[PDB]
Amino acid sequence: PLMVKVLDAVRGSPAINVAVHVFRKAADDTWEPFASGKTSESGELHGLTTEEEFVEGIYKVEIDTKSYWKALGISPFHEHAEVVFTANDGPRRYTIAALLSPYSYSTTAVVTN
Amino acid sequence: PLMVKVLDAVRGSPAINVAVHVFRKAADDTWEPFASGKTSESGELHGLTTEEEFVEGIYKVEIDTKSYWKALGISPFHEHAEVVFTANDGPRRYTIAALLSPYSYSTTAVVTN
Amino acid sequence: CPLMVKVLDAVRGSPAINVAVHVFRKAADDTWEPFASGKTSESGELHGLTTEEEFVEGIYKVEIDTKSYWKALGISPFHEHAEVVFTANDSGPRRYTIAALLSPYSYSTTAVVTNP
Amino acid sequence: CPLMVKVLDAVRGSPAINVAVHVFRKAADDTWEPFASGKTSESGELHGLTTEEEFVEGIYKVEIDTKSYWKALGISPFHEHAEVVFTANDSGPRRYTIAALLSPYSYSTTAVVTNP
Ligand SMILES: Nc1ncc(-c2cccc3cccnc23)cn1
Numbered sequence: 001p002l003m004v005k006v007l008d009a010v011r012g013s014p015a016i017n018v019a020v021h022v023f024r025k026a027a028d029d030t031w032e033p034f035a036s037g038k039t040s041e042s043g044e045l046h047g048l049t050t051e052e053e054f055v056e057g058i059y060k061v062e063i064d065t066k067s068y069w070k071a072l073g074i075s076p077f078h079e080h081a082e083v084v085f086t087a088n089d090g091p092r093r094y095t096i097a098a099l100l101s102p103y104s105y106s107t108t109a110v111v112t113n
Numbered sequence: 114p115l116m117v118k119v120l121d122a123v124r125g126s127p128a129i130n131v132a133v134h135v136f137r138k139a140a141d142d143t144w145e146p147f148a149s150g151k152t153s154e155s156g157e158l159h160g161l162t163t164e165e166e167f168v169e170g171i172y173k174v175e176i177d178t179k180s181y182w183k184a185l186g187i188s189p190f191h192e193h194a195e196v197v198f199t200a201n202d203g204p205r206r207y208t209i210a211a212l213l214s215p216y217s218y219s220t221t222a223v224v225t226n
Numbered sequence: 227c228p229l230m231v232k233v234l235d236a237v238r239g240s241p242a243i244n245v246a247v248h249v250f251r252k253a254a255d256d257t258w259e260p261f262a263s264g265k266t267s268e269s270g271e272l273h274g275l276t277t278e279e280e281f282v283e284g285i286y287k288v289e290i291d292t293k294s295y296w297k298a299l300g301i302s303p304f305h306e307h308a309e310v311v312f313t314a315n316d317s318g319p320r321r322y323t324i325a326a327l328l329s330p331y332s333y334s335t336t337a338v339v340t341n342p
Numbered sequence: 343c344p345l346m347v348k349v350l351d352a353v354r355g356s357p358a359i360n361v362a363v364h365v366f367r368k369a370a371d372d373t374w375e376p377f378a379s380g381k382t383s384e385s386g387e388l389h390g391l392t393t394e395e396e397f398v399e400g401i402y403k404v405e406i407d408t409k410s411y412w413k414a415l416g417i418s419p420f421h422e423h424a425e426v427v428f429t430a431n432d433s434g435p436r437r438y439t440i441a442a443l444l445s446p447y448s449y450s451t452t453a454v455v456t457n458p
C-alpha cells in the first residue's frame with residue numbers, strides 16, 4: 001500500500017541506499033515511528049507496511065537526503081526531505097516519489113486503484 | 114533501451130494515454146521521426162525502439178501535454194513538452210520521466226547500466 | 227531581508243497569494259521553537275520574516291501551509307504542508323530565498339543562497 | 343517587459359548566470375523564425391527581450407542553452423537545452439515569466455502569466 005521511489009537529478013540515476021523513515025501522527029500531535037528502510041538499486045523501497053497496518057491518518061515520510069549527498073561527495077542544502085500527507089480510504093495504493101538535487105527537491109504522490 | 118514515463122501532478126496519477134513522439138536529428142539539422150506511442154495505464158511507454166535502431170545522436174521526445182490536459186477538461190499553458198538530449202554509448206538504458214502540471218513541467222533522465 | 231519565501235501555483239500559472247508560512251528553529255533541547263511567521267503577498271512573496279540580528283545560526287524549518295491554500299481554492303490537496311529544513315549561517319551570514327512551486331499532489335522547492 | 347526569463351541552478355543554489363536564451367515565433371509557413379535572444383544577468387534574470395509592440399499573438403518557443411551553461415562549469419549535462427513552447431496573447435496581451443530550474447540530468451520550468 002505504500003512505496004517510496006527516489007531519483008537523483010545530478011547523476012541521472014536512481015537514488016540508491018537512501019534511508020527513509022515513515023511516521024504516523026499520534027493523538028498528542030507527536031510523530032510515532034511507523035516503518036523504515038533503505039532504497040534498493042532501483043531507488044525503490046517496497047515492503048514498508050501492510051494493508052492491515054496502514055490506516056487512515058497523517059503520515060510523514062522523512063528521506064535522509066543529507067546522508068545520501070554526503071556519501072556521493074556532493075554538498076547538500078537540506079537536512080532531509082519530509083513529505084507529510086493524509087491517507088484517506090475506495091481501493092488505493094500510494095507511491096511517494098522524490099527527485100533530488102543538492103539545493104532543491106520535488107515530490108509527487110501517485111495514488112492508484 | 115528507451116522508455117518514457119509520465120506522471121500527473123494535479124490528479125496524483127500516472128498520465129495515461131499521452132501521445133509521445135521521438136525524433137532523431139538528421140544531418141541537415143531537421144528532426145526525423147524515430148518512434149512514437151501512447152502511455153499505458155501505468156503512465157509508461159515501452160517498446161519504442163530496439164538496441165540496433167537506437168544509435169548515438171541527438172533525440173527529441175515530444176510529449177503532447179496539451180491534448181492530455183484538454184481530454185481531462187483542464188486548461189493548459191504549453192503546446193507540448195519537448196525533451197532534447199544526446200545519446201552517448203558502456204551499457205545503457207534511458208528512461209525519460211516527466212511530471213506534468215498545467216503551467217509547469219519537470220523532466221529527468223534515468224540512465225542505468 | 228535574510229530570509230525570503232516565494233510561492234507559485236502550477237495550476238493557475240500565478241503567484242500563490244495569502245499562503246501562510248511558519249518558521250521554526252531547533253532549540254538546544256532538540257525541539258522546534260517558533261521563530262517567525264507571515265503570509266505571501268499578491269506577488270507570492272513573503273518579506274520581513276526576520277532581521278540580520280535575529281537570524282542566527284541554527285537548524286530552521288520553513289512550513290508552507292499548502293493545505294489551507296488549496297482548500298481555500300476549493301480543491302482537496304494531498305500534502306499537509308511543504309516543509310523545508312536546513313542549517314543556516316554555519317559559515318557566516320547568508321541570504322536565503324526559499325521558493326516553492328505547488329500543485330495539488332506535488333510540490334517542489336529550491337533554495338537560493340547568496341553572500342551579503 | 344512582456345516576456346521575462348529567470349534561471350536557477352539546483353546544484354549550487356544560485357542564479358544561473360550568463361545563460362543564453364533564444365526565442366522563436368512560428369511563422370505562417372509553420373517554421374520557427376527568430377524573435378529575440380539574450381543572456382541572463384548576475385541575478386539569473388533576462389529582461390528586455392521584447393516590447394509590447396513586437397510581442398504579438400503567436401506560438402513562441404523559448405530555448406534556454408542549458409548545455410553551454412553546464413559545460414562552462416565543467417560538467418557534462420544530459421539535455422541539449424530546455425525548451426518552453428506556448429501560445430501567447432490569444433485572449434489579449436499578457437505578461438509572461440518563464441522560470442527554469444536546472445540540474446545536470448533534469449530541469450523544470452514554470453510559467454507565471456499576469457494581466458497588465
Ligand atoms: N518512477 C518515477 N517517478 C517519478 C518521476 C519523476 C519525474 C519527473 C519529476 C519528478 C518530480 C518529483 C518526483 N518524481 C518525479 C520519475 N520516475
Ligand SMILES: Nc1ncc(-c2cccc3cccnc23)cn1
Binds near residue numbers: 234327
Ligand atoms: N522566482 C522563482 N521562480 C520560480 C522558482 C521555482 C521554485 C520551485 C521550483 C521551480 C521549478 C521550475 C522553475 N522555477 C521553480 C523559484 N523562484
Ligand SMILES: [Ca+2]
Binds near residue numbers: 283315316317318
Ligand atoms: Ca558555524
Ligand SMILES: [Ca+2]
Binds near residue numbers: 399431432433434
Ligand atoms: Ca486571439
